[PDB]
Design a protein around this ligand. Structure first.
Ligand SMILES: [Zn+2]
Ligand SMILES: [Zn+2]
Length: 50
RNA sequence: CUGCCCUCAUCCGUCUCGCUUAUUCGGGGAGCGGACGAUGACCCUAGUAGAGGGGGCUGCGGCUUAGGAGGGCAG
């Protein structure tokens, strides 16, 4: 499926999911952190203590 | 304008800090705004402009870019 050029995340041409301006929520989120680029926890639970 | 970091994460501790609130108002109680701190990670390379590697996300096609808003610093 050569859909290159048409975004599927939002549905707007010119860019793709990788460059989707709506890239934030409503996706999947396995166990990564899109706030500190962390690998394991979630952004919603991303924070520091000591 | 771009990079990084922090805050909204119904987060925490600190702050002679600011605001609001209590039968629409003050150095206390609480919530929020600002600073500090979970790239677990950045470093290196050759022909140092810039470019690439794992690496950013992806419908794998890729491009190598940018990603909601406010503050600090750098050019
Ligand atoms: Zn899009
Ligand atoms: Zn995180």
């Amino acid at each position: 499926g050569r859909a290159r050029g048409l975004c599927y995340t939002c549905g707007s041409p010119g860019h793709y999911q990788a460059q989707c301006p709506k890239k934030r929520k409503s996706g999947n989120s396995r166990e990564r952190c899109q706030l500190c680029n962390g690998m394991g926890h979630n952004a919603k639970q991303c924070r520091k203590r000591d």
